[PDB]
Amino acid sequence: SLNDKIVTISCKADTNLFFYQVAGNVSLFQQTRNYLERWRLIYDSNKAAYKIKSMDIHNTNLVLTWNAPTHNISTQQDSNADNQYWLLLKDIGNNSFIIASYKNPNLVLYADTVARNLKLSTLNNSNYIKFIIEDYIISDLNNFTCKISPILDLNKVVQQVDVTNLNVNLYTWDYGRNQKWTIRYNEEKAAYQFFNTILSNGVLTWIFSNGNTVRVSSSNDQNNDAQYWLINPVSDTDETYTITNLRDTTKALDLYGGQTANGTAIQVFNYHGDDNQKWNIRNP
């Protein structure tokens, strides 16, 4: 559920524009992958409504606020006022939310992507009243091209061996397409895939018919859970994660034996959060 979740909020009408907070101003801005675009949702079960709290640091507890009687939006000090509560109405099937004012539910948030701001409007069938509300990790990682390193050796990366050898092992970073992965979140599966960039449609897979083996395999389908993964941030790190398999979430991506020699296998294994199951996901 959404209570106490830290999310980004982006525009269905422009998925590269995010709710951005600075100095009491709420605006629409390109992706920053930082606190300026992160919001905590705070549920009141009696109101059946949420406050949308900025993770701003400069100071204070600022929440998304309707500046009635204008149709403008800002961030103001939380006083639990009705103009700081919002109905989050999930448009089921459309991966989107309509965000209605608790004070005046006739009015909903509307993205003015020319002025790069939000206003309140009545409803219509356009995408300008629809918003993607996601865990910030999903948002930060979706469509991100990365290299993946074990924390035990940040100079080596998880790689496909070569264009037609779909085995996956550890090797020194060498700038190759086989050493880069594009992360894609699947809404329907609630999990991610890692597409190797040397191939068009090859994804990191647990080959469970062969023990703990991990290989790249074609993504022809959304039905094989073993081609999907959960990406779990490790607390009190910048960019370190565990990677568990959707077919069995007690199985984690695992650097065999904690060994860091070139050619060490990448496998899955019983997930206990050891250092050989922690991965740095970052820019190439």
From TrEMBL:
Binding, beta-D-galactose: D254, G257, Q267, N276
Pfam families: RicinB_lectin_2
Domain named Ricin B lectin: residues: 3-134, 145-282
Residues in the signal sequence: none
Database matches in InterPro entries: Ricin_B-like_lectins, Ricin_B_lectin
CDD domains the record matches: beta-trefoil_Ricin_HA33_rpt1, beta-trefoil_Ricin_HA33_rpt2
Protein name stated in the entry: HA-33
Gene designation: HA-33
